[PDB]
């Protein structure tokens, strides 16, 4: 079952990617690389599936703005998504869109992904 995940937000920016083999690439300059155990990949997939983000559509969401943009690409098996939006620094910004409920699922999934990546990179490289 194929897998891929990449998240981008931002030339100031933050970017991280998980390849199928567990390779984690991080960039924010600060560029880190490390291979995570299969248990980490398993947990990542569980979080993604639980978020139901794969069933969302970004059409109603705000397009890349001037303050910045966000990109979320995910592939799980035959399913895949490629979202592009403007920055979403808080819930007040989410609740100001046409589809606030859908955008909040995106906001929270992104928050969960960042928390996991920050913990992995931060503790591994003592950043």
């Amino acid at each position: 079952e194929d897998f891929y995940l990449r998240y981008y937000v931002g030339h100031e920016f933050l970017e991280f990617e998980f390849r199928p083999d567990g390779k984690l690439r991080y960039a924010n300059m600060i560029r880190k690389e490390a291979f995570v155990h299969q248990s980490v990949m398993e947990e990542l997939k569980r979080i993604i599936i639980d978020s139901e983000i794969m069933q969302e559509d970004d059409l109603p969401w705000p397009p890349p703005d001037r303050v910045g943009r966000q990109e979320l690409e995910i592939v799980i098996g035959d399913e895949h998504i490629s979202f592009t939006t403007s920055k979403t620094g808080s819930l007040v910004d989410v609740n100001r869109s046409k589809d606030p409920e859908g955008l909040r699922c995106f906001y929270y999934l992104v928050q969960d992904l960042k928390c996991l990546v920050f913990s992995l990179i931060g503790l591994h490289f003592k950043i």
């Binding site: 995570v36 155990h37 248990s39 980490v40 398993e42 503790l123 591994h124």
Partner: protein, 87 residues
């Protein structure tokens, strides 16, 4: 496995209502814990389900992994693995 700039374990299948003390009480016996990241699901207030645990040495992390994989936290079986591996 792959050591960090300490040695890090990745714990999964952690009960949603577990707090940091659940981790500390289970893992403190096998060595000095440098860091515990029991990440919260900010949308629900529950623990997301995983934790990173860093011991000072490899012997400690190995001992913890061998004894705690399969242990129970709040009645739920946890899995304990190395967090990083070599390419």
């Amino acid at each position: 496995p792959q050591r960090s700039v300490g040695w890090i374990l990745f714990v999964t299948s952690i009960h949603e209502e577990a707090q940091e003390d659940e981790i500390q009480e289970k893992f403190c016996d096998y060595g000095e814990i440098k860091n515990i990241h029991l990440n919260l699901d900010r949308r629900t207030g529950f623990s997301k389900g995983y934790a990173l645990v860093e011991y000072e040495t490899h012997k400690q992390a190995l001992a913890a992994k061998e004894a705690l994989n399969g242990a129970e936290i709040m009645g739920q079986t946890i899995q304990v693995d190395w967090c990083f591996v070599k390419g």
